[PDB]
Amino acid sequence: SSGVEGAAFQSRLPHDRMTSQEAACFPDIISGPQQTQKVFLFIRNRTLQLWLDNPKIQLTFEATLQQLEAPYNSDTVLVHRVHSYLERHGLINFGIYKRIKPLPTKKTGKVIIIGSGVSGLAAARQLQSFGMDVTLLEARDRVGGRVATFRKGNYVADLGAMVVTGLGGNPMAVVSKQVNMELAKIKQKCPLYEANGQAVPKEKDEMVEQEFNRLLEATSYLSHQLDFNVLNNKPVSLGQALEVVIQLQEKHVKDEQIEHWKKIVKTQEELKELLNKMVNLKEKIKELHITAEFLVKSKHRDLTALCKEYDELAETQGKLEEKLQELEANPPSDVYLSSRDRQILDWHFANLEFANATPLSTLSLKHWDQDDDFEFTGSHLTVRNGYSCVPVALAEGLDIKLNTAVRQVRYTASGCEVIAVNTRSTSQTFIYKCDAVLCTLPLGVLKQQPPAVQFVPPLPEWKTSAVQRMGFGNLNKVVLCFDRVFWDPSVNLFGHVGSTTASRGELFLFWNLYKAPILLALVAGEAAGIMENISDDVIVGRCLAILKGIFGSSAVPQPKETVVSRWRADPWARGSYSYVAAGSSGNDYDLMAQPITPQPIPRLFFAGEHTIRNYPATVHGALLSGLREAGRIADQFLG
């Protein structure tokens, strides 16, 4: 059955073997008769199926046992063990669902959670359902963090996370079902328009895209086959490696051109010298002008010798003017890419800078895509009613203190205290005592200088250096709400090709949710940081000019409503999301996940998108990170 096999896959597990995490929790199983290993795997896979088939209701141990078939419904103890495991690690009974057995009246252990984004909310729900006392401290006047939906009238647009990157294996598939989140496929077709507004023809678009793919592939070869990862005692950036590959392509074009020029010059020299000898054989004919009868025959066989010598040379001439005009009619390219072509290629680079939220010259060549292996399957989807329905639903029933900005975290062998100020009256402060702190502060806030939050005692060097090495990027959006659709409704995406390499990320991509009279323009790469220093009105004006160039200056009305994100300037984010910087690696994500112990017991815990090696810079990654920490905290305090 790919019923039960599907459940494992859907939970990011192999259907047919135990994980190292399972091995640690079930040592007796992995070291015992392999027969009972299969039994374990079936129970695990089937319990997952029971949960995934109906994630709106709590799946209890009882109900699991009553739905298993003989003889598995007789493995009472093993079923309990598997159920307890799946629940603790948040593989079942996560997100938001109806409880069957209500929450324990008295609570055990106190946990403060810093930040009320998806990671914080996910962890809170887990810890609460485990019977712990949980309070979330949130600096904004709203939950959700980098999930941030603009709503006004019937305009909905996402200023933060917007895309569910495939459902196959994605825990957001469960959450989606739970909160009745309407999801829609993104059509792939993305026509590009040049700076002057003219469509890039199919032919040219496909050629350039192909070159982009070859260039990326080449850097991958250089990095992972030829091990070119360090230069002049500096780790190589992806940007740097792309520049090298491009330079080699240009050298090859120049070589082929030179070889061609040398063939032409050779042929021209041959022609010039054959003319010369044919001009001399002509002077030798001019000058050619014993019985009378034998002189005639003699000066006959003389010319026929000279003439079938010359006619012979007019033929080696013929095959040379031919070979020449074939050369000068079949040149190789004189450039690798034209000015125009390079601009279009820059569109593809801008697109990559968007995905990674940073200029390519900052990305680690070796590690930038270290998380490729863990991509989900299925089409990428958008959220029709706005992504914020997820954090809003996850907040239901939780103790969340809004407008409460944490400034100090103290942790000792005997417990912790967290100091926060009200962001509306920075006079009044609060002190919250607890057994454990879960820090979900964005990497951007952890990097902040001077610091936004003081840790007492200071975080150990192994942690701060990780914080310092890791990249934290930027990406912004301009939302344009119109009263009518003037664009093509069967297109979700279209691209604007900029005019310089440096500014390639400026308003390079426009996005529409179908029927919604809204366009989103993206600002990526070096442009992202710079354009935050421009007012909404000027940046809006620049969008309209681009759209006017494409659709006609008369087809584009003034927008009714606009919003512009400035993630870098936002004090509660300080950027958009992590990336693997040159000099960093996936190992730094693991370092970020590691709890601090002041043996004393661990007191300070870390969740957030920057703490999950396999799923960084995503909502699902934030969510999984929360589930992880909740599991570790409960293990520590509840056993």
Ligand X SMILES: Cc1cc2c(cc1C)N(C[C@H](O)[C@H](O)[C@H](O)COP(=O)(O)OP(=O)(O)OC[C@H]1O[C@@H](n3cnc4c(N)ncnc43)[C@H](O)[C@@H]1O)C1=NC(=O)NC(=O)[C@@]1([C@@H](CC=O)c1cc(C(=O)NC3CCOCC3)cs1)N2
Residues that bind Mg ion (CB under 5 A): 214, 500, 502-503
Tokens of 526: 């070096």
Distance CA 561, CA 480 (A): 6
Judged by beta carbon distances under 5 to 8 A according to partner kind, the member of Mg ion, ligand X, none in contact with residue 502 is: Mg ion
For Mg ion, the nearest residue by Cβ is: 502
Q: How far is the CB of 419 from ligand X (least distance, A)?
A: 10
Report whether 163 belongs to an annotated binding site: yes
Residue 140 among known ligand-binding residues: yes
> Which structure tokens are listed for 437?
């702190």
Among the residue ranges 35-43, 236-244, 547-555, 615-623, the one whose residues contact ligand X (CB under 6 A) = 615-623
**What length is written for the chain?**
639
In the complex, the smallest distance separating the C-beta of residue 151 from ligand X, rounded to whole angstroms, is: 17
Give how far Cα 471 sits from Cα of 179, 281, 356, Å: 33, 78, 10
Nearest CB to ligand X, comparing residues 95 and 145: 145
Query: Least distance to ligand X from the beta carbon of 576, Å?
Result: 4
Say whether 162 counts as a known binding-site residue.
yes
Interface pick for ligand X out of 181, 452, 546, 591 (rule CB under 6 A): 452
> Which part of the chain contacts ligand X (CB under 6 A), choosing from 47-55, 83-91, 336-344, 573-581?
573-581
**What DSSP assignment string belongs to 122-187?**
HHHHHHHHTT-EEEEE-SSSSSBTT--EEEETTEEEESS--EE--SBT-THHHHHHHHT--EEEPP
The residues in 249-268 that bind ligand X, with binding defined as CB under 6 A, are none
445 binds ligand X (CB under 6 A): yes
Q: Which residues contact 295 (CB under 8 A, 6 or more apart)?
A: none
Strand 429-434 to strand 415-422: parallel, antiparallel, or no bridges (unpaired)? antiparallel
176 annotated as a binding-site residue: no
Q: Are the CB atoms for 85 and 109 separated by under 8 Å?
A: no
- Which of 29, 52, 114, 337: binder of ligand X (CB under 6 A)? 114
503 binds, among Mg ion, ligand X, none (CB under 5 to 8 A by kind): Mg ion
Record the tokens describing residue 402, joined without a space: 């809004």
Report whether 609 belongs to an annotated binding site: yes
Minimum CB separation of residue 336 from Mg ion in Å reads: 9
Query: Applying CB under 6 A, which part among 226-234, 266-274, 498-506, 570-578 lies near ligand X?
Result: 570-578
Burial call 440-465: b when 16+ CB within 10 Å, e when fewer: bbbbbbbbeeeebbebeeebeeebee
Residue 500's binding partner, choosing from Mg ion, ligand X, none, with beta-carbon cut-off 5 to 8 A by kind? Mg ion
Radius of gyration of the chain measured on its C-alpha atoms: 35
Q: Whole-number minimum distance, CB 365 to Mg ion, in Å? A: 17
Residue by residue, DSSP assigns 556-614 as -PPPSEEEE--TTT-TTTSSS-EE-BTT--THHHHHHHPPB---PPP-EEE-SGGG-TT
The H-assigned helical ranges of 26-139 are 27-30, 34-53, 61-67, 76-88, 118-129
Given the rule CB under 6 A, which of 44-52, 225-233, 588-596, 612-620 is the region that contacts ligand X? 612-620
Question: Which CB sits closer to ligand X, 475 or 634?
Answer: 475
Contact 549/510 with Cβ under 8 angstroms? no
> How would DSSP label each residue in 36-48?
HHHHHHHHHHHHH
3-class DSSP assignment, residue 415: strand
Give residues 141-170 in contact with ligand X (rule: CB under 6 A). 145-147, 160-163, 165
When CB distances are held under 5 to 8 angstroms depending on the partner's kind, the choice from ligand X, Mg ion, none that residue 4 binds is: none
Residue 573 binds to ligand X (criterion: CB under 6 A): yes
| Residue 118 touches ligand X, criterion: CB under 6 A | yes
- Cα separation, 346 vs 269, whole angstroms: 43
- Which of 482, 511 has the CB closer to ligand X? 511
Two structure tokens written together for 492: 């979700």
Binding mask 454-483 for ligand X (x = CB under 6 A): ---------------------x--------
Name the one range near ligand X by CB under 6 A: 89-97, 117-125, 217-225, 329-337.
117-125
What x-and-dash track marks residues 371-400 binding ligand X by CB under 6 A? ---------x--------------------
Alpha-carbon span 573 to 473, nearest angstrom: 10
Q: Binding partner of residue 619 among ligand X, Mg ion, none, CB under 5 to 8 Å per kind?
A: ligand X
Three-class DSSP category at 11: coil
For the chain, how long is the longest CA-to-CA vector?
143
Three-state DSSP at 416 gives strand
Q: Which residues are annotated as a binding site for FAD?
A: 119, 138, 140, 146, 162-163, 609, 618-619
Site for ligand X, rule CB under 6 A: 114-120, 137-140, 145-147, 160-163, 165, 186, 380, 405-406, 440-442, 445, 452-453, 475, 567, 572-573, 576-577, 608-609, 617-619, 622
Q: Which residues are annotated as a binding site?
A: 119, 138, 140, 146, 162-163, 609, 618-619
